[PDB]
């Protein structure tokens, strides 16, 4: 945290600075100081080059692993080309695809992814803001932006907006006197990246450029490990399991091959051979298209996602530390309550004005409304009518604008009133008077006599009144009412609302002629003994969807923590409003208040909810923070500095949770930058928050956050299904080569054949899984533990490889035997044949029958086998597709049927295979031969068994949720 | 990784992989049923005969003469084994790949079958069935020679099985 000079006297400060308070630095001195220190500018990271952006992706996890395969596949090509020249594309091309998959895969992401007013030599002049240096005198007024960090020497009625630091917009006063030990808290310092809302002030520049509090946040919050995405972390667990098996078997097939009588030449080639089988080449692309496809839906939702990984990040978090202003809220506020007819009323604060009407009827109400509209200077900027009232910009102070907006809304045009009762004279609100009054000609034509209207400090207005308009009629101001007012005044004040008193007087016509002149300068007319009409307070409302959005997250099992720069009374009120604090929940202070016991007396454990001021937070050790975090379900950190927001997040992360920071302002930057995922508001959001964030809510629709979390759920599951679906086919692809070596039988399936499965046939089906629905109420479950529940786990491998893929292999092997057997080569004869079969020289090979086959002839038969094997997989893949559609549910229950995309997959997939078989040229180009109709049927019993086997298994899982089948098999 | 539950795993697969081998075999054995003992379901692969040669690149029986095809009868077991007819500058021997019920039809480069045999009945039907010189001037060089057979029934696949109905070999007698 920073350490400073606010303690120093102004004179002391100048002494340190070698500057003059009145005159400011000399032109000569300013220049000298410039060269010494450097410019009032932030030192950048460099822009980031285009080349590097692409290159970083090239590693992308699986990408590197794929390199090891390609390189290792080259290990095969190198040894082979050397010692045993096998002229073939097999290992070379095999190796090539793996790497290129990254270059082509990487594309998926690339294709989808000022002036200041200073005083120098006693004269003020405007200068390029960069020219500002520490020491000079700067003047700021309402509407301006603070040019640099400043020490307030002098100020008049100056208010500032420090949302950049706090995230809270309500204006803060600036005075020369140091308010608090904390520099972020004190009144005497005005910070760059902040704007003077109103008033005028002068201060001495303490810090410039990078040195300012915010001018560093970026570097401190930017150069911070913005952590990664829960999805990225998960997409690595599966690959390790996959690699684990690929290596186990790959090598195991080295040793086994060795015992059988294969050399270092042969045993080695197999190990590397054993790859295309364990590594899913298709998987990266699928996950990406899945992520990309989901993002598209969200876009349709009016929810734009900058990062693919961002689609999921919405589910593996325990606690969420949210910034209030611009994150939870849209950034705004207004009036709130009125007191008249000895009763407290509540106006609708909402933008939408979704609330209800409090009171039209009272005669009192109108008299009050009259003063609010008349004793009021504010005006709406011109050309507003298109926009709604609460939205439109008004010229005038906040309190007056509030009254104007209130009346315009409930009353109709204010201008109408202003016209109907012309303003003759008024005494503008004085600092001393603490009240503002006006005199107006009454619209009432019988009367058009003079009416006096005034407003100001509630205590002051009361000092001024004789009577009270209760209902339509006036009444003496008995002590009884004097208190009822006093109670209302205290209560509304408690709400954290600003309160104004209102009263009017029907002037006695005799004393005031129609012409009668009034004197604003000296009380030409009565200031005292007036009729007190009522009270009006203030208040602020949050977005519409937010309370529900908060509710949804909580059901999700997500902890929502407010983290705001704003003051605690306000923070807590909204916390209750949004649901961060639930009804009945209590802080220690509320208990002590109700009990009327001391705080020391209250047991902290009794309080579920907490509200911690930044000033207090500052004193606490991180362990203390951790306990507060552990100890409470509903937490509100208020009046927090930007660094504090960061600490909370770190504290939350220390627990192990995945935290999403949602915020709008420059003050949220370090937090957003720290969060596992930073979400920023698109419209309201400062540029800084936007740069800091992972995601932008273009709409400022908070509800989108719920969708975001949801997006990380359905697809995550559906992705596993697509992995399972893709991986299963690996087995039927691997086994033929192995048996080929072990059995010494002719090669059942070829390298080219595999590619058509992986690149052609499996693709649409695999992708189609994304369309799958929820088997259960996904929202109902807790977020996944990123560490514990991986995307690809051992239960997936066992299911894909051990069971299902195994059934698939036999289906393929069967077609193999049928084709050869039909051809005259019975299975028994097949063993040990490959050497003769492969032997190019022998034109003579004798089959079981006794016939003799040439080299080409038998080869055509084998190629036909390659073709039928290919087909067998597609037939079995149909079953795998249907079963993969659901993890728990029966096809009957889910209806395998609804997914249109999936069904499209079966038809097109089969069409492709038939094409490869039937089309002419395919026999040369891809060595695919035509298949007799009978050949199509061979795998059919195998396909059916798979469907039944899985269906039976899931029925088991459902019946006994607790135990074994689920434990082993359940993805 | 469990304990006192592995018995629930081992026993599972024992009679699940059991059930599956049992079904897999179940379907091979049905398939096998629907094939002739004497003749494959598809001849088509073998459709044109290939020609292969010797150089690695009779008691009982019947006396015969060069003549027309001899029909043994149908391809059936009711008759016993169908009777079969009797039968430097390297010598190479050529034969025609045997194909059941196939009747072959018949009724300068550098310097360098009887119908009575067919149709071939097949091994089951005919076990000890018997199917039916380059003195050249040149030497110390690689000579490419292609021996081939002709017939309407015979076809060649130049682009593919160079074996189909023909040979291609490169003799070299370096002396």
Curated annotation (Swiss-Prot), chain A:
Catalytic activity: K(+)(out) + ATP + H2O + H(+)(in) = K(+)(in) + ADP + phosphate + 2 H(+)(out)
Topology of the protein relative to the lipid bilayer: Multi-pass membrane protein
E.C. no: 7.2.2.19
Membrane-side (Lumenal) residue stretches: 71-93, 256-267, 740-749, 814-865, 919-933
Effect in UniProt of substituting residue 758 to Q: Has potassium-independent constitutive ATPase activity
Consequence when changing residue 762 to E: Reduces potassium-dependent ATPase activity
Modified residue annotations for Phosphoserine: 399, 537, 776, 890
GO biological process, one term: proton transmembrane transport
A Pfam family recorded for this sequence: Cation_ATPase_N
Keywords from the named record: ATP-binding, Cell membrane, Hydrogen ion transport, Ion transport, Magnesium, Membrane, Metal-binding, Nucleotide-binding, Phosphoprotein, Potassium, Potassium transport, Translocase, Transmembrane, Transmembrane helix, Transport
Top EC class, one word: translocase
Stored PROSITE patterns: ATPASE_E1_E2
Binding site residues for Mg(2+): 323, 325, 664, 668
Positions annotated to bind K(+): 276-277, 279, 281, 733, 758
Top-rank taxon: Eukaryota
Transmembrane spans: 50-70, 94-113, 236-255, 268-285, 720-739, 750-770, 791-813, 866-885, 900-918, 934-954
Effect after changing residue 758 to D: Has normal potassium-dependent ATPase activity
Annotated localization: Apical cell membrane; Cell membrane
Activity control mechanisms: Down-regulated by K(+)-competitive acid blockers (P-CABs) such as vonoprazan.
Result, substituting residue 281 to D: Loss of ATPase activity
Ranges where the record places region Disordered: 159-181
NCBIfam families assigned: ATPase-IIC_X-K, ATPase_P-type
Name of the protein in its database record: Potassium-transporting ATPase alpha chain 1
Species per Swiss-Prot/TrEMBL record: Sus scrofa
UniProtKB/Swiss-Prot annotation, chain B:
UniProt topological domain (Extracellular) ranges: 27-175
Keyword Transmembrane attributed: yes
Residue span of region immunoglobulin-like: 107-175
Compartments (UniProt record): Apical cell membrane; Cell membrane
Functional summary from the UniProt entry: The beta subunit of the gastric H(+)/K(+) ATPase pump which transports H(+) ions in exchange for K(+) ions across the apical membrane of parietal cells. Plays a structural and regulatory role in the assembly and membrane targeting of a functionally active pump. Within a transport cycle, the transfer of a H(+) ion across the membrane is coupled to ATP hydrolysis and is associated with a transient phosphorylation of the alpha subunit that shifts the pump conformation from inward-facing (E1) to outward-facing state (E2).
Residues bearing carbohydrate: 63, 79, 106
Protein name: Potassium-transporting ATPase subunit beta
Species classification: Eukaryota, Metazoa, Chordata, Craniata, Vertebrata
Recorded topology in the membrane: Single-pass type II membrane protein
Disease link: Parietal cell autoantigen associated with autoimmune gastritis.
Family to which the UniProt record says this protein belongs: Belongs to the X(+)/potassium ATPases subunit beta family.
Database matches in Pfam families: Na_K-ATPase (PF00287)
InterPro entries for the chain: Na/K_ATPase_sub_beta, Na/K_ATPase_sub_beta_sf
PROSITE patterns in the cross-refs: ATPASE_NA_K_BETA_1 (PS00390), ATPASE_NA_K_BETA_2 (PS00391)
